[PDB]
Amino acid sequence: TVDEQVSNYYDMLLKRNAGEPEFHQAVAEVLESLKIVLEKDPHYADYGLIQRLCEPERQLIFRVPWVDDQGQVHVNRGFRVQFNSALGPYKGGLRFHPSVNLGIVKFLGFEQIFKNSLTGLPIGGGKGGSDFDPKGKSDLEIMRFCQSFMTELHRHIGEYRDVPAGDIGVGGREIGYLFGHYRRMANQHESGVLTGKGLTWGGSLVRTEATGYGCVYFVSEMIKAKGESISGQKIIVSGSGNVATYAIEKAQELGATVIGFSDSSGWVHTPNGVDVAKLREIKEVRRARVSVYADEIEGATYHTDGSIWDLKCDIALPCATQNELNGENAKTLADNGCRFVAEGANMPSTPEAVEVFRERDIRFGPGKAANAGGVATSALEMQQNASRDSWSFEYTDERLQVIMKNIFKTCAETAAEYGHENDYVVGANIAGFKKVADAMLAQGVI
Amino acid sequence: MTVDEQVSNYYDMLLKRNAGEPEFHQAVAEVLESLKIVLEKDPHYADYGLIQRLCEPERQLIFRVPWVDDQGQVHVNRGFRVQFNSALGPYKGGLRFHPSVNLGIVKFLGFEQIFKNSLTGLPIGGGKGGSDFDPKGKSDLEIMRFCQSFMTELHRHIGEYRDVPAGDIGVGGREIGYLFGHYRRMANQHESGVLTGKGLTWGGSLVRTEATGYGCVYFVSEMIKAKGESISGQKIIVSGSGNVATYAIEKAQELGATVIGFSDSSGWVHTPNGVDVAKLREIKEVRRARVSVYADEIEGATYHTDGSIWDLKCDIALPCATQNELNGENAKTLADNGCRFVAEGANMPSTPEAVEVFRERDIRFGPGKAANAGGVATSALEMQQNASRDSWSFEYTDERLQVIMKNIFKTCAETAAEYGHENDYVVGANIAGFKKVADAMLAQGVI
Amino acid sequence: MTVDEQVSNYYDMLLKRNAGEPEFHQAVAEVLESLKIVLEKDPHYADYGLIQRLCEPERQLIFRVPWVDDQGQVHVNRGFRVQFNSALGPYKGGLRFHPSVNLGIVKFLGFEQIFKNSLTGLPIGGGKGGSDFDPKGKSDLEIMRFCQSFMTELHRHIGEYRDVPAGDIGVGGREIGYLFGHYRRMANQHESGVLTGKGLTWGGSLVRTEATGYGCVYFVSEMIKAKGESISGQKIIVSGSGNVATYAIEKAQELGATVIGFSDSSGWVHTPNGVDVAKLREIKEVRRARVSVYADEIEGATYHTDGSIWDLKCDIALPCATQNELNGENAKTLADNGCRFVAEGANMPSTPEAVEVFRERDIRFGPGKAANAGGVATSALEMQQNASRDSWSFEYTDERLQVIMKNIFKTCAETAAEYGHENDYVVGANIAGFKKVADAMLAQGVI
Amino acid sequence: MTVDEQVSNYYDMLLKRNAGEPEFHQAVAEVLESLKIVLEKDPHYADYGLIQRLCEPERQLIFRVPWVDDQGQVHVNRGFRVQFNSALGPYKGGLRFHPSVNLGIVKFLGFEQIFKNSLTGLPIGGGKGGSDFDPKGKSDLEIMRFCQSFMTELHRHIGEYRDVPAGDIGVGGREIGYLFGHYRRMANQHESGVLTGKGLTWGGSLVRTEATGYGCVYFVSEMIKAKGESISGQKIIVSGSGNVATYAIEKAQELGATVIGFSDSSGWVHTPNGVDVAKLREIKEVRRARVSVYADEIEGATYHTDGSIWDLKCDIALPCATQNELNGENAKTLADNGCRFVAEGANMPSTPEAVEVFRERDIRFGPGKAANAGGVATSALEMQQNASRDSWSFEYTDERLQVIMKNIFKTCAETAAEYGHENDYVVGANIAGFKKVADAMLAQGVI
Ligand SMILES: NC(=O)C1=CN([C@@H]2O[C@H](COP(=O)(O)OP(=O)(O)OC[C@H]3O[C@@H](n4cnc5c(N)ncnc54)[C@H](OP(=O)(O)O)[C@@H]3O)[C@@H](O)[C@H]2O)C=CC1
Ligand SMILES: NC(=O)C1=CN([C@@H]2O[C@H](COP(=O)(O)OP(=O)(O)OC[C@H]3O[C@@H](n4cnc5c(N)ncnc54)[C@H](OP(=O)(O)O)[C@@H]3O)[C@@H](O)[C@H]2O)C=CC1
Ligand SMILES: NC(=O)C1=CN([C@@H]2O[C@H](COP(=O)(O)OP(=O)(O)OC[C@H]3O[C@@H](n4cnc5c(N)ncnc54)[C@H](OP(=O)(O)O)[C@@H]3O)[C@@H](O)[C@H]2O)C=CC1
Ligand SMILES: NC(=O)C1=CN([C@@H]2O[C@H](COP(=O)(O)OP(=O)(O)OC[C@H]3O[C@@H](n4cnc5c(N)ncnc54)[C@H](OP(=O)(O)O)[C@@H]3O)[C@@H](O)[C@H]2O)C=CC1
Ligand SMILES: N=C(CCC(=O)O)C(=O)O
Ligand SMILES: N=C(CCC(=O)O)C(=O)O
Ligand SMILES: N=C(CCC(=O)O)C(=O)O
Ligand SMILES: [K+]
Ligand SMILES: [K+]
Ligand SMILES: [K+]
Ligand SMILES: [K+]
Ligand SMILES: [K+]
Ligand SMILES: [K+]
Ligand SMILES: [K+]
Ligand SMILES: [K+]
């Protein structure tokens, strides 16, 4: 039977991949959606397709030795998982955070395959990063770390090979140091090697805003599917980094009010809305804690207690990290009348959180659909670079809006095609999978 | 201790490291004078040894070029490629074959290339190269063999993303063909983006011939609008009658202005109702004759041998002939006659005294650095066409060139005002070319 | 804090970075115990984060290996290459195809290999690789397709100066042939130095087949002579029945000892009157059969699936199968029954409890990184022969191997004594191997 | 049409192409005087523009070397590699890190290197490189970071068959370690043959440390014996106190001579009872202190800041410091005081006036391209060891070195005499060095 075939393969996978719970978590949800497609179209398991799909094409782990400002040598671990290249070059971000390990990178890279497929743009899936902690490091220490990291990474990447970008801990600053050092290693100005670049050295307008903006563009599409208006809505946006910052900005441009945001230290309550300019100054100039925002803003309350999800909202947009919204937060959310969740972060909702949303009739936008705005805009940066062109903000934002609407459409149409109307998780996973699978079938056993 | 003191200290050290290169010294001194204004407002532009990095080429290649003449005699020349700065894109800049070429000349021109290319707003870095090979008196086969020997070494250092050379004195379409053909032979690939100035049927761009002349006129049109005026119905002088002047005349008249004079080394022509571009080209390209031959045949146009083209009463003067062709006396004549606008199509045609006269007399001045950048802009457009495997129409390309020139003007105007020098386009051009490179260098780290 | 504390704290951190890899933790733990001793005397050895760099692989590659079986069914296995340390030379170490393989096991092997390779005195860094592919039951064509898929990825990461693999469990001459053929196809060149354990007519070395087992016996003979005994007349257990075990048995019996038992993973054979090497070779190499078949065919040999081979009373135990095959209970049984010498042909066959028993019970114990190093030493001789396009005689190469094993023993004994742990070859091996690598690492900077 | 006129006309052209490089002109002029002697007997040596090709480097690289000091300040130095001639082997020659370094100095050294390398009889072309980086006062980490930045560019231009650098002034074992480590990191392979002067545990050669100084003494011994004298009991001046000077002192005293003075750039020390090698090594290698500190801590040794080391009465002078350190005035003094032999450990230490005085006063003179060749010869032996993956004994290597220096002497004396310039080892060295290179260039065609 199909259900048992897939369950028995998942079991095999758990054995080969012992101790990688985030990867198991990512895989599990996808294969659950894959069961549906195999019942209708069995050829999708032909030629060991699922066995190939779930094993990364290549994984790199490497030493990153570097020297701090006191002349002390440090060693961190670097990673690049090149998961699938059926649709185009490996594509996906780099995360510098002390939590990072191979299992986490594999989870992100596996998800990235289906996210990138969903954009409709020609990009395969990958991810990388390091257990390096950028917090408390000088710009020179960050620079030397990025240079050491790229000293190994450059041989494994390239405009058609693998195109990284930022993620947690890797912003414009780091992409700058990584790109410069890549050019030094390769002796060429290969703009297409990375995305997230600066506007004067091959970057794209809107890329900075893309993930957070598209998240909101997606959530507004789920909201308007219920005959509702995002204007006038109360929104929680967890996190205070690249994705959260611009999610808040688009949200409040659209008539909504963001009532809370957070970092890993705690969360701040803003019942009358966020000052974007203030927050950007605290986070980007001062690289400070959100409590400083509370300290300086009238009526902003810093919290170290409870959770940001204790706030009454109509919409929640988790934009920080994996497993930041759990089963209990999900209940608290629905009890206070939350109506839609859409993920800016990668895999922020736990499995039981997702279960609650279903039980409680909360419309749920999965990250691989909702946050695809980032990588889609990265693919647009790649397109601009490929043609040595530079697009306006308006034109690029318009394309991003079109892609997000296309992703919504695909999720809706496929979910309904397989008898799971309005289940966007089912729609996203099946639609992302089928395009990859068809390409893999066409390109043979490789 | 002070800003002046630290910069002067550095310039002194540059002199010592770069002994015997006075042109490069002077080019660097001119840049350092621009940084002073910048540092005064924002010191961070000298952080992380930015100036010390900027003034040292990323890489310099010098190499033997052995070749054999038609009589079987072996000759040895020296080849050069200075890859100065790649912060904004691949190294970009021409190749010159002339006995005067040496490393200091190449470094000088390569350094200046960085900022001119930056100022276009397009993703190109800066470099320069060539050889002391003298093409004069050489046969086509001798020049081919030289180009082939030259590129046997050069090919390994260049590439669509690495370094994209072009022509200059001694390196025209003929040489670009021989260099490109041999590059493909060495590399075993048909990499169109390795060079610009290529033939139309093998990766070249329309508007290349017209670019520098057209761009000068686009630039001056923006200067004119900035004063509440329009270029249509104005009277314009265009000096010279070569590549730049021909196409400067063509565009100005397209935009509805009337051109009243042109010239060669020998003399100058008054054409009070307009130039016959078709006639001029025939005279100069087909017949390779003097401009006197022109005046005979047009009813209303008169030739002149005495005085100067700059005696003519005009609204706009576009010197498009040669360095130092417009002196302080000329500048005075123009201003007295009511000329309100000068923009340079040629290389430094206005003498330093002429430049001060425009300032004194309130004539708006478009320096060549900005106004004659159409040629380099179109080189970037060739790269863009090659990158997308497309060959654009004349009209589309010319439209893109106009947008680029408009943006160069905007950048000059905005930057000049930013630094307390409203409407001083030389200040604007100098500062804007530097700051874009500097910002990109800061972002990309110590490399 | 105390060296003990510092090293223990570092180890704790390593357990966290490398969760779920007990064999890697085991290998690291014993080396770090010896390193405490060297650090107590010469603390400079921790300078510049040397230990932190040493215990973190330079590079690790994991990759998909898709292949098609004889029924046309697609299978997917995982491939690995850990390139641990290159201070002393190219990464060097074998490839293991066994269903137990995972990244933790490959890391343990690669880590051990650094020090083993250092101890040979030859210029070789350390690495290891393999796959969870199970070669048992596969046809030659299936093995071939697997090796070709494996090398389709591996080739870009290896090379005569980059990384030089070889066999290990499940990878013998058959697999090396298919791996080498396909490397040449991928690289388009006949790069003999890319692999060792090659066939004699395409760049292999005489003695390499025999080397690990011969070397193990040469090493244990030195241990025995150091105690004033001699190997002739002794009873020896040799576990396993593969490449290492076969030639340990051959050399042991040449030197006048009698091998009283051997095994595979299914069971063990008691051979009270010694082993017929020719019969064992026919069974294992031709028939690829179980050791039970030897017992069936040989008068006086008995097959067992009960108990352990380590239940046999012996003078010398040579575990030659795999990691953790000789445990604390086995060690006590061996000791109680009169075993006086243990030398490891396998990598890490003795569990930590077993090693403690040997220490406590005064059993002389030759760690794998010393006793089994004859294989990789002879691989380096294969590399030397290839580099010089020479082919040495069996007698010359075997003489070199004898001198190396004697040198390794002398290094372990002297280093152990130097550091106040006389006759502790674990301490001697780890310290001597570490110092050479650490010196080379200090000289070569932070890389 | 006369040989002098032919060669003189070329020199004039060399002068204009290489303006501002007096040391390079100095080195070329003296070689060209020898080529006139060659051409008078064998005019074919100028065929196919051979001399024009010989005197122009095949390739020259100049590059930015940005690095960060311990206080986090960015510095920029200039790096060079001149790849002069590769007719006989890969480019070969050292790296000089000193504030005096510029292209003309690198060119002089690279030019000399061609003929020196030729004379060794071993398969090595000629090159040189360096930087104006001053290693004096820098921390180990600063030196490491500089080397790593230097090699980040240099790696793409070097390699076992391409270009093999080594040390020279300011570049010792410490630097070579950091350069080699970083090269392996850039190339991702353990390519031992990329550099010489490597450490003993990572592909170095025994004798290389001692080789230049030892070889200089071996050479001067041959000069001495040729005059019917012997080295034992003689009084020797050795200028400098670095790698070359140190081992010239060691070998000279091992052979029974007394070294009565050495120096650094600050002053000289008088040692009438001979030098304590171990002490000098301590002061210079560990403490990196001044020679004056030797005089402080050693009874009988006196430091001088007046006069020159060259006014010590000696039998033998070995200049072992730098170019142009022994002038016409020093040469006269030496001779007046009874000096009979001079042999150059340094490159081009004797000025042209000094060399005329030696001739005029019957002082036998060994030019550096002969006398100092032991260093590069032993580098070639390191390359041979690496190529064959062998490591030779000190005794074997030193005996090869002895044979090479005797052969170089014989070649110089025999060639000098063949051309009618008996005992002129400058003519002998230049002609013998040149002919081997030229014959190989003729065979390899116009490239
Ligand atoms: N940037 C992009 O283009 C895209 C990003 N994403 C995903 O969106 C999420 C955020 O990315 P991005 O905004 O770029 O990263 P940033 O580093 O710019 O911001 C991360 C934010 O989340 C917080 N955070 C990080 N780790 C944790 C944690 N372990 N527990 C609680 N909070 C944490 C950070 O706070 P603190 O300072 O206290 O650590 C910070 O406020 C990630 O899941 C990322 O994978 C998805 C698509 C695109
Ligand atoms: N074309 C381009 O894209 C580029 C142009 N430039 C600069 O632009 C200027 C012109 O370039 P280009 O048009 O290509 O050169 P051309 O050779 O095509 O044309 C030059 C014209 O200037 C005339 N001329 C020279 N000197 C004088 C003078 N003293 N008084 C009046 N006329 C004179 C020449 O006449 P005559 O036949 O009698 O000599 C000829 O008519 C130069 O300063 C050049 O360096 C620089 C780079 C590129
Ligand atoms: N070959 C070399 O040059 C060197 C090998 N070594 C080490 O020597 C040992 C043997 O290697 P080698 O002889 O080359 O390998 P082979 O594959 O030729 O032989 C392995 C033998 O050990 C038995 N064995 C393997 N795995 C297990 C297991 N998990 N449990 C019980 N028995 C097992 C096998 O029996 P079965 O068929 O039932 O699996 C077989 O008899 C390994 O530790 C290896 O790393 C060390 C240095 C060099
Ligand atoms: N090393 C080699 O293998 C070979 C080197 N050579 C040549 O040998 C010479 C020395 O090289 P090497 O010993 O390796 O370099 P080192 O840097 O090890 O030592 C150079 C020595 O010369 C001293 N010195 C520099 N200038 C003077 C001066 N003007 N008067 C007196 N002493 C001075 C330096 O003193 P201070 O510290 O004050 O600068 C230092 O004691 C150079 O000409 C080199 O090109 C030739 C062949 C081989
Ligand atoms: N960090 C990203 C964006 C990746 C990208 O732009 O390649 C993500 O999709 O998680
Ligand atoms: N399997 C080996 C030897 C492999 C080799 O010869 O490189 C080992 O030392 O474990
Ligand atoms: N510094 C040296 C030795 C160079 C080398 O060993 O390649 C010289 O010959 O000048
Ligand atoms: K690459
Ligand atoms: K393209
Ligand atoms: K190229
Ligand atoms: K390879
Ligand atoms: K015995
Ligand atoms: K039996
Ligand atoms: K190289
Ligand atoms: K004597």
Short mmCIF file of C-alpha atoms in Angstrom, two decimals, chain C residues 48 58-59 83 86-91 123-124 156-157 160-162 380 383-385 387-388 400 436 439-440 442-447, chain D residues 140-141 144 148 160-161 173-174 176-182 184-185 187-192 200-203 386-391:
data_model
loop_
_atom_site.label_atom_id
_atom_site.label_comp_id
_atom_site.label_asym_id
_atom_site.label_seq_id
_atom_site.Cartn_x
_atom_site.Cartn_y
_atom_site.Cartn_z
CA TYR C 48 47.06 29.12 18.09
CA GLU C 58 39.49 20.31 7.02
CA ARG C 59 36.63 19.10 4.81
CA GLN C 83 39.57 14.94 4.43
CA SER C 86 46.80 17.70 5.22
CA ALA C 87 49.70 19.15 7.19
CA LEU C 88 52.16 16.32 6.37
CA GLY C 89 50.93 15.50 2.83
CA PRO C 90 47.89 14.74 0.65
CA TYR C 91 44.90 13.27 2.56
CA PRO C 123 54.58 12.41 3.82
CA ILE C 124 50.87 11.64 4.10
CA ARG C 156 36.53 16.09 -8.35
CA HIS C 157 37.70 15.92 -4.68
CA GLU C 160 47.72 12.64 -6.62
CA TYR C 161 48.47 15.69 -4.38
CA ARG C 162 44.89 16.29 -3.14
CA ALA C 380 52.93 5.64 0.45
CA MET C 383 52.77 6.60 -4.30
CA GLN C 384 56.57 6.95 -4.34
CA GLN C 385 56.92 4.28 -7.04
CA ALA C 387 55.75 9.49 -8.62
CA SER C 388 59.08 8.23 -9.93
CA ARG C 400 61.41 -1.23 3.51
CA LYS C 436 55.02 15.68 14.00
CA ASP C 439 54.96 20.98 14.40
CA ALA C 440 53.96 21.00 10.73
CA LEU C 442 52.47 25.51 13.52
CA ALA C 443 54.89 26.09 10.65
CA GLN C 444 52.13 26.34 8.02
CA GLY C 445 49.95 28.93 9.82
CA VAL C 446 46.24 29.33 10.39
CA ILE C 447 44.70 27.60 7.40
CA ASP D 140 54.34 36.47 13.85
CA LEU D 141 50.61 36.98 13.13
CA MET D 144 51.38 35.38 8.69
CA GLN D 148 48.50 34.93 3.34
CA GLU D 160 55.46 22.74 -9.46
CA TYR D 161 56.15 23.11 -13.21
CA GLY D 173 61.75 29.47 7.04
CA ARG D 174 59.01 31.26 8.98
CA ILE D 176 58.02 29.97 3.62
CA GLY D 177 55.89 28.01 6.10
CA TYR D 178 53.08 30.59 6.04
CA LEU D 179 53.33 30.98 2.24
CA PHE D 180 53.23 27.20 1.65
CA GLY D 181 50.36 26.61 4.08
CA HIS D 182 48.32 29.25 2.38
CA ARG D 184 47.84 24.58 -0.21
CA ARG D 185 44.68 26.23 1.10
CA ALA D 187 44.96 25.27 -4.48
CA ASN D 188 43.40 22.58 -2.27
CA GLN D 189 46.33 20.33 -2.72
CA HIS D 190 49.54 19.36 -1.04
CA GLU D 191 51.80 20.30 -3.90
CA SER D 192 55.25 20.13 -2.26
CA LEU D 200 61.99 19.12 7.28
CA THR D 201 58.67 17.50 8.25
CA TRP D 202 56.66 18.96 5.32
CA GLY D 203 58.81 18.33 2.21
CA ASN D 386 59.60 16.18 -3.87
CA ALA D 387 59.09 14.97 -7.45
CA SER D 388 60.34 11.48 -6.56
CA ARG D 389 58.72 11.51 -3.05
CA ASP D 390 62.09 10.78 -1.47
CA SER D 391 64.02 12.47 1.36
#
